Design a protein around this ligand. Structure first.
Ligand SMILES: C=CC1=C(C)/C(=C/c2[nH]c(Cc3[nH]c(/C=C4\NC(=O)C(C)=C4C=C)c(C)c3CCC(=O)O)c(CCC(=O)O)c2C)NC1=O
Length: 139
């Protein structure tokens, strides 16, 4: 189930991602150009239940990172966008993956799936919604 996410991905499309980042209160300097950012993801999994994801943030800041979690187990995150007290939990909803972050009383959601070969993520903060899609690297 998670297996279909594993691999290396490069951005292909980005939609309203700068306004999304602006919507979660991310700094202007970090929100500006958000759809021009080219992250590379390195996704792996273990026992069908734990996942690891290394991100190479790429130009210009190279805020490279990694997250490790278990499906269901809430964990603490320290996001590029500079928020605090962030608790995140990831769970399978059917064949989609659902990622929820909570901080400062607030809630944002990330829904990721596979769509004609592309890893597609819909980001939701309120009714501010962004979409980005990744194609296999480099194939
Ligand atoms: C299969 C599951 C899956 C997971 C778990 C996954 C996680 C994931 N995807 C991204 C890209 C990444 N980066 C950012 C934010 C930024 N990007 C920039 O260049 C800058 C400056 C910012 C900060 C303002 C977000 C919101 C995301 C998540 C959206 C995405 O996956 O593309 C991150 C880094 C977010 C951060 O550094 O705080 C993580 C942990 N991607 C997947 O496909």
């Amino acid at each position: 189930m998670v297996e279909k996410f594993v691999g290396t991905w490069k951005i292909a499309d980005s939609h309203n991602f700068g306004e999304y980042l602006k919507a979660i209160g991310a700094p202007k300097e970090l929100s500006d150009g958000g759809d021009a950012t080219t992250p590379t993801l390195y996704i792996s999994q273990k026992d069908g239940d734990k996942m690891t994801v290394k991100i190479e943030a790429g130009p210009p800041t190279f805020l490279d990172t990694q997250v490790k979690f278990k499906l269901g187990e809430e964990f603490d995150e320290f996001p590029s966008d500079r928020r605090k007290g962030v608790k995140s939990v990831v769970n399978l909803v059917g064949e989609k993956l659902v990622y929820v972050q909570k901080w400062d009383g607030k809630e944002t959601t990330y829904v990721r799936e596979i769509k004609d070969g592309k890893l597609v993520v819909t980001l939701t903060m309120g009714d501010v919604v962004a979409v980005r899609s990744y194609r296999r690297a480099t194939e």
